[PDB]
Design an enzyme around this catalytic site. Structure first.
Site, PDB file in Angstrom:
ATOM      1  N   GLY A 121      20.607  85.205  23.927  1.00  0.00           N
ATOM      2  CA  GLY A 121      20.728  86.635  24.151  1.00  0.00           C
ATOM      3  C   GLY A 121      22.184  87.060  24.211  1.00  0.00           C
ATOM      4  N   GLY A 187      36.219  63.869  42.238  1.00  0.00           N
ATOM      5  CA  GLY A 187      35.801  65.010  43.024  1.00  0.00           C
ATOM      6  C   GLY A 187      34.906  64.601  44.174  1.00  0.00           C
ATOM      7  N   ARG A 278      32.244  73.903  38.826  1.00  0.00           N
ATOM      8  CA  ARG A 278      31.538  74.540  37.727  1.00  0.00           C
ATOM      9  C   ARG A 278      32.203  75.868  37.401  1.00  0.00           C
ATOM     10  NH1 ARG A 278      26.740  72.371  36.220  1.00  0.00           N
ATOM     11  NH2 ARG A 278      25.770  74.380  35.673  1.00  0.00           N
ATOM     12  N   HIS A 450       8.706  69.543  72.257  1.00  0.00           N
ATOM     13  CA  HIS A 450       9.194  68.218  72.580  1.00  0.00           C
ATOM     14  C   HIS A 450       8.155  67.170  72.206  1.00  0.00           C
ATOM     15  CE1 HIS A 450      11.139  64.903  74.778  1.00  0.00           C
ATOM     16  NE2 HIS A 450       9.904  64.552  75.085  1.00  0.00           N
TER      17      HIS A 450
END
Ligand SMILES: Cc1cc2nc3c(=O)[nH]c(=O)nc-3n(C[C@H](O)[C@H](O)[C@H](O)COP(=O)(O)OP(=O)(O)OC[C@H]3O[C@@H](n4cnc5c(N)ncnc54)[C@H](O)[C@@H]3O)c2cc1C
Ligand SMILES: Cc1cc2nc3c(=O)[nH]c(=O)nc-3n(C[C@H](O)[C@H](O)[C@H](O)COP(=O)(O)OP(=O)(O)OC[C@H]3O[C@@H](n4cnc5c(N)ncnc54)[C@H](O)[C@@H]3O)c2cc1C
Ligand SMILES: NC(=O)C1=CN([C@@H]2O[C@H](COP(=O)(O)OP(=O)(O)OC[C@H]3O[C@@H](n4cnc5c(N)ncnc54)[C@H](O)[C@@H]3O)[C@@H](O)[C@H]2O)C=CC1
Ligand SMILES: NC(=O)C1=CN([C@@H]2O[C@H](COP(=O)(O)OP(=O)(O)OC[C@H]3O[C@@H](n4cnc5c(N)ncnc54)[C@H](O)[C@@H]3O)[C@@H](O)[C@H]2O)C=CC1
Lengths: 473, 473
Positions: A121, A187, A278, A450
């Site tokens: 598109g 990274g 990114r 609990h």
């Protein structure tokens, strides 16, 4: 001339949610997608379903179960004679889940009446959208509104271009057919830590090279310090302040050159993952006269409601500003669809949670202690360690803590930070409270079941004001 | 002879929390406890820490890990050659956790300045408390306020009296040193299902005999139906409408006689667990002229602030009305201590969550669909199955659903019910929302992290008003 109330470009979490919501609101909706999946046909779901969130979590879950069986069964009395992992089978389960979920999106489109177009598109002038099919033929759609949701792609770096099957990005790292013996990761962000964890658990010797001196700078400093210690103990050799300058592939291995505090270094790996962020995808997306403008970093420029410079044209998700997260993209898609339908939907970008799916899991919502200190906001902090949680002891999983930060004057909760079991669920509890403007004492006054991990949030909230029951305030 | 602002009788979740909170508030506090634990020293923590919540969850977690390794590893590519379980080692891990946690309460008592007495406490007239030590010495404490927290014990039934090590209650069932080949359980309540699950996972053939025709009547009917289905798949032979009438021990086996729809039946087991409720403990607790009264069922009569008929004398936890749960007892302890200190503290009995620690976990808060129907409240219901959760698929754990019930006129959430992974954490999210008066649309408008199990609650809330994204509406 096929006319639609809404034309969505892209079918990732942003686009496919926007399309469904628009159809639910009675808008005649089209969604355009170009990605070819594993079966050779167009696959919906974007990065998150195909090469992102879901595949990573599938491998994280499988690899953790193997790791626990290998390293943490004896204390329960469980003896496992020779546990092994079949990597092809592990990856195949992941691929099967991806197949099922992407097909499920198409089923949702059909149930909601979304019209699907297969191809590329491109926004033309006057809110017309050109769809280039897989056969190269074009069709032009007339749109009352256009939602651009074209997503992002991995950042590339000159020293380490993708190469065969030896240098990969996150997509290839989800497709290894054998455990890499020595694994390099460039990274130490969320992808590097998650995918490094997958393969370390299965026996890879992993080195993570991170350019910055500070580990997980967006996380609370106390959380990040604990994360670095624990992940290093798990076998992630995280090297901070490492500037990668070159690589070389030879003899089916890759040698990386980098500079750290002690000068030039070299390290050799069988596989190298490049996980350095990114960037937004706008390639061939906008005609020259479309009217839509980009910012300095290549994102589509939008306001707080994701409206572009062109009326009736919106942009959402990874292609616009803000946290590049799937739930951020989807919520923007909902907002845009609802506003097109006439509702004054708004988004609170202040309560978007973050999760890192390591084990221990890391999650937070709101502001860190270091941020609030930089802003001059006086705060009270309460913490509770999972080492003091009965539920966590029963689970044999006592690493980490919960941290609640509150305004010192109003007691309003300003941030919740967790490293440990079910971190994401506990942070979501905190986020729900913060949506209603909870104080720390509000959380303290509630009944928590609990034994549950949730009790650690309850105790941390009480500790803000110095009356947790189960720690020495 | 010795004067205290607060004297607490019992050191379970009610009493030890009340004592710590009272000390935190500056009250000179004493706590009396008689229970001798496994190390031969007095052990605090009551039923919950010593023979209840924590030991059960330890065995549930260990047995689940073994079960998953045996039945649910191959889909991940994980091959386990000959997985075995050492029951003595599993029980020893549980015992060590109990030791550490009970010792931790004693550390908290010391850090907060609580004075411990070892022995039996008895309330005399005029708020005096007689302490008979385990050494037989008697002394009287002059108390400004007394908190009675004497707890409960298992119900006994004539047809199945405890016998040696063959017919046991929940305490003995947490101490088996070997997997019984055939295990009988009387009562399909939470204990019967939890402890039945433990031993079924380790290879026992388990039969559960339940007197009532309806399974888990307190749970939402849809949840209970799903629970019965999954527990049947896991190997629990649950027999409804089975009225036990007699038992007989011979040759280290026990034969149980019971009546069902088809008449009288007999079945023989290696061990029999009697799990048919708990009753309040008042033995030698109250002098005849203490002024404290009991109700028809043997509970101490108290008002909504846990105040007895005698000013300055309170009773909390399992010995008074309300859900016999640890977090109920502890919250009552906090309320009573705060009221003694002069605060107009209150307790909200409407949002106490319930959890059943099967796998899948079962949890809920608020009202069931059948309760609301009986009350004539028109509601909208939304559900989302974990089969449609991407996170749950990655986890290989897709059984169950989330159910949100909202008022049809106001959209206020009236109940949240979950069976599936992390049920308790998701219900706690719902409970926090309900504390703030959330509508279903409120929850639908919040940002939930993706991919997380919490998203199932978000989708169920959206489904209330017919616009969940990821299932048809
Ligand atoms: C390994 C990895 C793990 C991740 N894990 C998580 C996680 O656990 N939690 C989380 O919140 N986020 C996670 N993310 C981030 C998440 O995937 C993204 O934030 C999310 O996918 C963004 O959604 P989007 O719709 O904006 O873009 P995308 O998901 O990238 O979808 C964009 C779609 O648009 C298509 N497209 C682009 N241009 C065109 C065009 N002209 N015409 C037609 N179609 C086009 C693309 O084919 C694509 O399908 C992860 C990412 C990676 C890489
Ligand atoms: C197998 C089992 C599993 C359970 N699992 C859960 C769960 O997962 N979650 C949950 O919420 N609840 C659970 N429960 C219920 C929970 O244990 C009780 O609701 C809770 O312990 C009640 O706390 P309490 O302080 O009122 O009483 P108790 O815990 O029974 O403590 C009472 C204390 O008072 C002592 N005492 C009694 N009389 C005297 C006296 N005159 N003088 C001095 N000391 C005295 C007793 O020795 C005891 O220690 C479980 C119960 C069982 C049996
Ligand atoms: N659990 C989740 O929410 C997940 C979401 N994501 C998102 O996808 C996007 C991309 O993820 P990441 O690649 O991990 O980006 P990131 O921004 O989270 O981490 C990238 C790291 O690489 C460092 N970096 C940049 N250039 C470098 C270089 N030459 N050498 C060494 N280090 C360098 C950066 O300092 C950073 O620490 C992010 O927005 C992330 O939030 C991806 C995986 C999981
Ligand atoms: N996860 C949790 O919160 C747990 C809390 N508890 C609490 O301890 C208390 C007691 O636990 P349970 O023993 O399971 O009681 P329960 O009330 O939960 O269930 C007892 C069951 O036995 C049935 N019963 C009574 N007499 C019977 C007879 N002759 N024959 C067959 N069935 C008979 C009853 O119908 C009932 O279903 C409860 O209040 C429970 O909530 C105990 C274990 C776990």
């Amino acid at each position: 001339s096929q006319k639609f109330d809404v034309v969505v470009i892209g079918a990732g979490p942003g686009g496919y949610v926007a399309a469904i919501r628009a159809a639910q609101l009675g808008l005649k909706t089209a969604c355009i997608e170009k990605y070819i999946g594993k079966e050779g046909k167009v696959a919906l779901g974007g990065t998150c379903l195909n090469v992102g969130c879901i595949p990573s979590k599938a491998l994280l879950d499988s690899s953790y179960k193997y790791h626990e069986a290998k390293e943490a069964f004896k204390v329960h009395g469980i003896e496992a004679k020779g546990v092994t992992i079949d990597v092809p089978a592990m990856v195949a389960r992941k691929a099967n889940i991806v197949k099922n979920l992407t097909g499920g999106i198409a089923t949702l489109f059909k149930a909601n009446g979304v019209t699907s177009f297969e191809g590329h598109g491109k926004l033309l002038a006057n809110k017309q959208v050109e769809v280039t099919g897989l056969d190269g033929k074009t069709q032009v759609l007339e749109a009352e509104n256009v939602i651009i949701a074209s997503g992002s792609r991995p950042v590339e770096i000159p020293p380490a271009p993708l190469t065969d099957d030896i240098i990969v990005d996150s997509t290839g790292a989800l497709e290894f057919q054998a455990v890499p013996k020595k694994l390099g990761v460039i990274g130490a962000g969320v992808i590097g830590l998650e995918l490094g964890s997958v393969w370390a658990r299965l026996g890879a010797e992993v080195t993570v090279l991170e350019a910055l001196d500070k580990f997980l700078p967006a996380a609370d400093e106390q959380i990040a310090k604990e994360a670095l210690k624990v992940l290093t103990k798990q076998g992630l050799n995280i090297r901070l302040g490492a500037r990668v300058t070159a690589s070389e592939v030879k003899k089916k291995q890759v040698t990386v050159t980098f500079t750290d505090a002690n000068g030039e270094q070299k390290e050799t790996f069988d596989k190298l993952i490049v996980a350095v962020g990114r960037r937004p995808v706008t390639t061939d997306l906008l005609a020259a006269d479309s009217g839509v403008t980009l910012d300095e970093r290549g994102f589509i420029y939008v306001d707080d409601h994701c409206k572009t410079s062109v009326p009736g044209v919106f942009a959402i998700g990874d292609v616009v500003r803000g946290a590049m997260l799937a739930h951020k993209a989807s919520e923007e898609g909902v907002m845009v669809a609802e506003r097109i339908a006439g509702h004054k939907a708004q988004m609170n970008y202040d309560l978007i949670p973050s999760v890192i799916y390591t084990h221990p899991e890391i999650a937070w919502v709101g502001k860190t202690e270091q941020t609030l200190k930089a802003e001059g906001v006086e705060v009270n902090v309460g913490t509770f360690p999972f080492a003091a949680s009965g539920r966590a002891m029963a689970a044999n999983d006592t690493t980490g803590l919960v941290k609640v930060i509150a305004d010192a004057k109003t007691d309003r909760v300003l941030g919740v930070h967790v490293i440990g079991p079910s971190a994401a669920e506990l942070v979501q509890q905190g986020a729900i409270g913060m949506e209603f403007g909870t104080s720390a004492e509000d959380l303290g006054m509630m009944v928590f079941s609990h034994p549950t991990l949730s009790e650690a949030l309850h105790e941390a909230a009480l500790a803000v004001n110095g009356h947790a029951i189960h720690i020495a305030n």
